[PDB]
Every structure is written in structure tokens, then in C-alpha cells.
Design a protein around this ligand. Structure first.
Ligand SMILES: O=P(O)(O)O[C@@H]1O[C@H](CO)[C@@H](O)[C@H](O)[C@H]1O
Ligand code: BEF
Ligand SMILES: [Mg+2]
Ligand code: NA
Ligand code: NA
Length: 218
């Protein structure tokens, strides 16, 4: 049986992928880049703050100074952090709280494997911190998603091999990171976005311990 579940945060635990999208789009448009639409944003889900800004600048083949790059990333983060102040337990996605409870009852470790430096704050907003055995700090890894490092780190932090773990993700970059870690990915979203080569569920209510078992048994 699997011994850990490695949770992405944004778009898996709660709807904060939507807020990242809205904040990046606002930022892009301030600098005259209009290509950050929902389709493009699939390339930003699960990607670090700095890598995200760089992808936006590349979309338009735009160079900015190092000083401006720093200011832009800070501006978007400040906006995003204001947006999320009112996140509460009511914003936890369906099925997620009950999954955490069921995992703990079955002695399955729970680790966060988010690309976001805002992860700990969000878990606190949602009263979820006590469910997590570890949080892999995305600032500690040498390589961010789609590199597997964050998922490997999350597994190691709870004393479990990646190959005995399930990873839950909503993003192209994160699915690739899970694959390359050795963990088993179960995506949430559209196969049109995430691929037809892993198990994908349409919404998080499908993330039950019963289903994770159904999938692991195969
Ligand atoms: O700015 P943060 O909260 O540190 O982090 C990151 O930026 C990306 C922007 O695309 C999001 O998609 C990530 O999921 C979120 O971790
Ligand atoms: F979207 Be995850 F929190 F990197
Ligand atoms: Mg995500
Ligand atoms: Na449930
Ligand atoms: Na139950």
C-alpha cells in the first residue's frame, strides 16, 4: 500500500490557482503583455514565481532590467497576498478535508509539495496545518517544478520513498515532476490540459482514500 500522499496546494487543496492567474494577468497587462489568458496560464500552473514571470516576459520576447524583474515579481506577489487574506476553511476544495482525516486514520503520511512560498500561510488560513506531517520548502530545492526535487523532498521529509507515494496535482509542470520523482500521479482537471496518459479526475471530490486505493491496486 502507498505510505504517503504528496499534495500540491494551488488548484488541489483550494482554488488559489485562479488567483495566481488573475494576479499574473494583471501584472502582464501593466507591462503591455496581453497573452496571459487561461490557455497560456496552463504553462504557469505549478511554476515558481521567478520562472512564471520569465515565461510571461518570453511570451512577448521582452527584456527588462534585473531591478525591474525583482520589482515586477514583488508587485505580483504583493497583489496575490492581498487577494488571499480572506481565504478560510470554507474555501477548502470538496473532499480534501475528509481525505486528510482518512489518511491520518490509516497512518498514511501527508506532505505538502507546493511551488508556492505562500503555502504555509494558506494552510494556516484554511486550518489545515495540523493535518500535514511535513511541508517541503520550495526555496530549499535546487530545481523547481517540473523538476522532481520538491516531490522527492516531500517524500523524504515524511520518511517514505517516492515510489511508495501518490502525488496529487492540477498542473502540467507538476504532473511531470511527480512522474520523474517515481511517485504515482493522479491529476485533477481536464485531460485536454493534463494528458490522457495518467489517471485524471474531474474535480477533487474524486480524491477519496477509497479511490486512491482503487488506483494504487490498479
Ligand atoms: O508566488 P508563489 O506564491 O511563491 O508561487 C508560485 O507562482 C506560480 C505562478 O504561475 C503559481 O502557478 C504557483 O502554483 C505558485 O507557487
Ligand atoms: F500549485 Be502547487 F501548489 F505548486
Ligand atoms: Mg497547482
Ligand atoms: Na470525501
Ligand atoms: Na468516512
Amino acid at each position: 500500500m502507498f505510505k504517503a500522499v504528496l499534495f500540491d496546494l494551488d488548484g488541489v487543496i483550494t482554488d488559489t490557482a485562479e488567483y495566481h492567474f488573475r494576479a499574473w494577468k494583471a501584472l502582464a497587462e501593466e507591462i503591455g503583455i496581453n497573452g496571459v489568458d487561461r490557455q497560456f496560464n496552463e504553462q504557469l500552473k505549478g511554476v515558481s514565481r521567478e520562472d512564471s514571470l520569465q515565461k510571461i516576459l518570453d511570451l512577448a520576447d521582452k527584456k527588462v532590467s534585473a531591478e525591474e524583474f525583482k520589482e515586477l515579481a514583488k508587485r505580483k506577489n504583493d497583489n496575490y497576498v492581498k487577494m488571499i487574506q480572506d481565504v478560510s476553511p470554507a474555501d477548502v476544495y470538496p473532499g480534501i478535508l475528509q481525505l486528510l482525516k482518512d489518511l491520518r486514520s490509516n497512518k498514511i503520511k501527508i506532505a505538502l509539495a507546493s511551488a508556492s512560498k505562500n503555502g504555509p500561510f494558506l494552510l494556516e488560513r484554511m486550518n489545515l496545518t495540523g493535518y500535514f506531517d511535513a511541508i517541503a520548502d520550495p526555496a530549499e530545492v535546487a530545481a523547481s517544478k517540473p523538476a522532481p526535487d520538491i516531490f522527492i523532498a516531500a517524500a523524504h521529509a515524511v520518511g517514505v520513498a517516492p515510489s511508495e507515494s501518490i502525488g496529487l496535482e492540477d498542473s502540467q509542470a507538476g504532473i511531470q515532476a511527480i512522474k520523474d520523482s517515481g511517485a504515482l500521479p493522479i491529476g485533477v482537471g481536464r485531460p485536454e490540459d493534463l494528458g490522457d496518459d495518467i489517471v485524471i479526475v474531474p474535480d477533487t471530490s474524486h480524491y477519496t482514500l477509497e479511490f486512491l486505493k482503487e488506483v494504487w491496486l490498479q
